[PDB]
């Protein structure tokens, strides 16, 4: 039984004193790495000054506002409003309400169906008003097409579905820039360009799920920045606080915010914001990401090296592919690299995960896809640690297959 | 907006150094009062040791478990499962999923309609609230209660048992002005629920963790709920967290029998749990809940009721650490100062005189920290009177 005693930077240590590199940044979230005392201190300060309560009585510099202001500053242009939640998934629920409630107020209440992709639908409990298009997963679902052309097809499928459902019954299309959860499904070059093209010609809202891509994970602040999308709403969480304290929220384009306020501010609960203690943490977490240039350094210094290094693993017999951008990476485990076939039923990723655990690496396995989203602050040294331990474990996995 | 610099016990101080008594315990939540360093220290400790989960490994004593264990210990008997959320309202959403998903797995997917009450929450239907003071006209409290309870049975039949998933109610409606039910209500509702195959959800977001004097409102009115939404006083509002407590029989049906929506991550944020656990440790181990029941509550209630003499007060009501004051133009008919917005004025004068009572229309309400002292109750009822006198004066 293996118990963690201490955590620092990108590393955990067990009771035995064995060092572990957390390649998944806690669970997608721990951006600035473990043990940043500044965040602890933010929380502490607020918790004793005034833990809860806003409006009528409030602190000298309410963290709710200053955090929102901070978020809108790093957001895509046009995104001026932030409605905070206690979690990321609460964010996605909230956005579903907001898009439907939005269209109602425009006097088009028929607009209700949400178009998701396969393997990124979310909760929402087939519901006679959430439909799916195929995911842009070339490696698994693109057979023998070129990435580029597969992308275009998977993008066109959106247009088809909008028409099939009918524009006047569609409320919104909603997608993670990169699905990352379903195994870092990085789209072909051509996808988002084409989806942009489509969205431009239909009167539907566009929700970027930045729960995972948010706050530096792509190298840019948001995946929406990276793929250059113009979303109407953005769900955030996780890296908002580097996972040091629960918080989520929705960033909202001005034009949309104005509609859920004017007309009817009943459901616009004059942004009671979120919890002061969470916000205080979030604000310091954002201050740190911008002011110590961690996002910038991820883009310019960590990312390029991580990607290069990770790709060296392509030589390994077991690896059908390495893919990744920013601080996202994935490794496909195949029986034959040519046909991209898997070790059917053997559950190989499981084995590879096992060996990662045993050898002081945290990669997550999504089926036969190993994935990584390490803290944005990982060093060259630590990337060397990572790709090294990765290889050890790939060798062990292969060995174990015989 | 007045600028608070520090908070202690049941008191805030502004920049001017003026002392303010928070009669609403933050917003229903701050149970143990402000500035308990123990809670700050719990959060701090966890935030640096291990702020969030990872796929593989965990700390020596994960606070998620220890908190759930702690909750199940204070819960009504049978309540063995806790699914945590990031908020209270996320709890109520979650429970809506759970009750519907529950019935589906029993092979009765038509069971979906939720029966709420008016002023607390086809899809979702409502019955009338047990608010004798406003909506009972000239009936006796007892008989009005029975009627308001019978209205449930009527609605179940109207909707039809095979389409009803659940009935869902706060034991006492906090939000909507401390709507304390007649004696007879909950007894009768129990009677009704006993004869229909529907689930019963207690919304303990507000009544939870001592507010009634017992741990839960469900304890107090002696209800046998199938699910309980919690939040707020779980951490004394020091850090956001919520959850659902779930009867064994229900939990067994949503886990095995229909392996689906209990993996995932409902395990709850370690940092929040650490706080929650210490908050609960404090409530049980320093006997705050017990002392609320036995020492604080009786005195608060007594004292508060002295205000009944005031011209403006149609009624004082309250149990445990809940209280309400009705502001009327004529005590006989229970009429209000229609349209004058009197509660507004009374609230205003409370703010200006270092008291936080919340106004729900013309109902002033209080839910002070469970730790309020006799001294502080004296402070409260005293400032209350001052402000009632000021409000009345201002009406001329």
Q: Where are the beta strands (DSSP E) in chain B?
A: 2-8, 11-14, 19-22, 79-85, 113-117, 124-127, 164-169, 199-203, 227-231, 242-247, 313-317, 323-327, 355-356, 358-360, 363-366
Q: Do residues B238 and A46 make contact, with C-beta atoms less than 8 angstroms apart?
A: no
What kind and span of H or E run contains A113?
strand A113-117
- Give the structural domain span for A387: 4-30+293-400
- Resolution of this structure in Å: 3.4
Query: Are A350 and A264 members of one domain?
Result: no
**End-of-domain residue from the set A238, A263, A291:** A291
Structure tokens at B127: 């019955």
- State the Cα angle at A46 between A40 and A48, rounded to 5°: 105
Cα–Cα distance between A399 and A395 in angstroms, integer? 6
Q: Residues near B220 by Cβ (< 8 Å), separated by ≥ 6? A: B171, B207, B212, B213, B214, B319, B320
Handedness of CA B85, B86, B89, B93 (dihedral sign): negative
CA gyration radius for chain A? 22
**End-of-domain residue from the set A291, A309, A333:** A291
Q: Do residues B67 and B237 make contact, with C-beta atoms less than 8 angstroms apart?
A: no
Q: Is B250 helix (H, G, I), strand (E, B) or coil?
A: helix
Cα–Cα distance between B132 and B143 in angstroms, integer? 10
Restricting to A residues 269-328, those with a Cβ less than 8 Å away from any Cβ of B are 274-275, 277-278
How many residue pairs bridge chain A and chain B with CB atoms within 8 Å of each other? Answer: 177
Q: Which of A64, A112, A114, A122 is nearest to A92 (CA)?
A: A122
Query: Are B268 and B337 members of one domain?
Result: no
Q: Report chain B residues whose CB lies below 8 A from the CB of A87.
A: 85-87, 90
- The verdict on residue A392 lying in a domain is yes
Count how many domains chain B has: 2
Q: Report chain B residues whose CB lies below 8 A from the CB of A90.
A: 85-87, 90, 93
DSSP per-residue codes, B310-358: STTEEEEE-STT-EEEEE-SBTTTTB--TTS-HHHHHHHHHHHTTEE-E
Query: Are B79 and B217 members of one domain?
Result: yes
Q: Is A400 an 8 Å CB contact of chain B?
A: no
DSSP state of B54: -
DSSP state of B51: S
Helices A380-400, A303-311: inter-axial angle, 10-degree rounding: 30
Query: Are A162 and A216 members of one domain?
Result: yes
Q: Which of A205, A212, A211 is nearest to A229 (CA)?
A: A205
Query: Are A107 and A122 members of one domain?
Result: yes
Cα–Cα distance between B64 and B82 in angstroms, integer? 10
- The verdict on residue A35 lying in a domain is no
DSSP state of A142: -
- State the Cα angle at B6 between B3 and B10, rounded to 5°: 105
Query: What burial class does residue A262 get, using C-beta atoms within 10 Å of its C-beta: 0-12 exposed, 13-18 middle, 19+ buried?
Result: exposed
Q: Residues near A381 by Cβ (< 8 Å), separated by ≥ 6? A: none
- The verdict on residue B259 lying in a domain is yes
Q: Do residues B31 and B25 make contact, with C-beta atoms less than 8 angstroms apart?
A: yes
Query: Are A124 and A8 members of one domain?
Result: no
- φ, ψ of residue B85 to 5 degrees: the values are -130, 175
Q: Do residues B164 and B111 make contact, with C-beta atoms less than 8 angstroms apart?
A: yes
Mutation for A interface: B24, B33, B62, B86, most A CBs within 10 A: B86
CA gyration radius for chain B? 22
- The verdict on residue B35 lying in a domain is no
How crowded is residue B295: how many other Cβ atoms within 10 Å of its Cβ? 13
Dihedral class, residue B249 (left if φ above 0, else alpha if ψ from -120 to 50, else beta)? alpha
CATH number of the domain enclosing A73:
3.40.640.10
What separation in angstroms does the CA of B20 have from each of A57, B6, B8, B382, B388?
Answer: 10, 11, 10, 13, 17
CA diameter of chain A: 69
- The verdict on residue B159 lying in a domain is yes
Cα–Cα distance between A35 and A6 in angstroms, integer? 9
- The verdict on residue A361 lying in a domain is yes
Restricting to A residues 356-385, those with a Cβ less than 8 Å away from any Cβ of B are 356-357, 362, 364
In chain A, helix, strand, coil percent, each to 5? 40, 20, 40
Structure tokens at B318: 């309250």
- The verdict on residue B18 lying in a domain is yes
Handedness of CA A139, A140, A143, A149 (dihedral sign): negative
Q: Which of A11, A26, A30 is nearest to A376 (CA)?
A: A30
Query: Are A193 and A308 members of one domain?
Result: no
Query: Are A188 and A251 members of one domain?
Result: yes
Query: What does DSSP say about strands A369-372 and A248-253: parallel, antiparallel, or unpaired?
Result: unpaired
- The verdict on residue A140 lying in a domain is yes
Q: Residues near A1 by Cβ (< 8 Å), separated by ≥ 6? A: none
Which residues pair with residue B179 across a beta bridge? B173
Q: Is A64 an 8 Å CB contact of chain B?
A: no
- State the Cα angle at A104 between A103 and A106, rounded to 5°: 60
Query: Are A213 and A320 members of one domain?
Result: no
Q: Residues near B140 by Cβ (< 8 Å), separated by ≥ 6? A: none
Cα–Cα distance between B17 and B9 in angstroms, integer? 16
**End-of-domain residue from the set B252, B285, B318:** B285
Query: Are A259 and A185 members of one domain?
Result: yes
Cα–Cα distance between A13 and B375 in angstroms, integer? 51
Q: Do residues A330 and A379 make contact, with C-beta atoms less than 8 angstroms apart?
A: no
Query: Are A249 and A345 members of one domain?
Result: no
- State the Cα angle at B86 between B84 and B89, rounded to 5°: 95
- State the Cα angle at B91 between B86 and B97, rounded to 5°: 125
Structure tokens at B381: 């009822």
Cα–Cα distance between A369 and A281 in angstroms, integer? 33
Q: Do residues B58 and A357 make contact, with C-beta atoms less than 8 angstroms apart?
A: no
Report how this structure was experimentally obtained. X-ray
CATH number of the domain enclosing A384:
3.90.1150.10
- φ, ψ of residue A292 to 5 degrees: the values are -105, 10
Cα–Cα distance between A31 and A236 in angstroms, integer? 14
Cα–Cα distance between B337 and B359 in angstroms, integer? 14
DSSP state of A365: E
Query: Are A152 and A263 members of one domain?
Result: yes
What separation in angstroms does the CA of A121 have from each of A34, A50, A174, A187, A361?
Answer: 31, 38, 8, 17, 30
């Amino acid at each position: 039984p293996r118990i963690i005693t201490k955590a620092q930077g990108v590393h955990l240590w067990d009771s035995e004193g064995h060092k572990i590199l957390d390649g998944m940044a806690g669970l997608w979230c721990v951006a600035v790495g473990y043990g940043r005392e500044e965040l602890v201190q933010a929380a502490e300060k607020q918790m004793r000054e005034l833990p809860y309560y806003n409006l009528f009585f409030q602190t000298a510099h309410p963290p709710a506002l200053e955090l929102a202001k901070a978020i809108t500053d790093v957001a895509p242009k046009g995104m001026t409003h932030v409605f905070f939640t206690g979690s990321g998934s609460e964010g996605n629920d909230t956005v579903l309400r907001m898009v439907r409630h939005y269209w109602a107020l425009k006097g088009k209440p028929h607009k209700q169906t949400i178009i998701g992709r396969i393997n990124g639908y979310h909760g929402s409990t087939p519901i006679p008003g959430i439909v799916h298009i195929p995911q842009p997963y070339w490696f698994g679902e693109g057979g023998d097409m070129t990435p580029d052309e597969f992308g275009v097809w998977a993008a066109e499928q959106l247009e088809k579905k909008i028409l099939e459902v009918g524009e006047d019954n569609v409320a919104a299309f909603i997608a993670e820039p990169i699905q990352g959860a379903g195994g870092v499904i990085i789209p072909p070059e051509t996808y988002w360009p084409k989806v942009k093209e489509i969205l431009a010609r239909y009167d539907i809202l566009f929700v970027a799920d930045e729960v995972i891509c948010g706050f530096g994970r792509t190298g840019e602040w948001f995946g929406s920045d990276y793929y250059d999308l113009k979303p109407d709403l953005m769900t955030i969480a996780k890296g908002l606080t580097s996972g040091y304290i629960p918080m989520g929220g929705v960033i909202v384009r001005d034009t949309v915010a104005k509609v859920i306020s004017e007309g009817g501010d009943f459901n616009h609960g004059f942004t009671y914001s979120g919890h002061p203690v969470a916000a205080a943490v979030g604000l310091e977490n954002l201050r740190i990401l911008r002011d110590e240039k961690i996002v910038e350094k991820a883009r310019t210094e960590a990312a390029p090296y991580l990607q290069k290094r990770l790709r060296e693993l392509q030589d390994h017999p077991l690896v059908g592919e390495v893919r990744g951008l920013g601080m996202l990476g994935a490794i496909e485990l195949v029986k034959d690299k040519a046909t991209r076939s898997r070790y059917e039923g053997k559950g190989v990723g499981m084995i590879c995960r096992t060996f990662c655990f045993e050898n002081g690496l945290i990669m997550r396995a999504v089926g036969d896809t190993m994935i990584i989203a390490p803290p944005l602050v990982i060093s060259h040294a630590e990337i060397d640690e990572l790709v090294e331990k990765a290889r050890k474990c790939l060798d062990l996995t292969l060995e174990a297959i015989q």
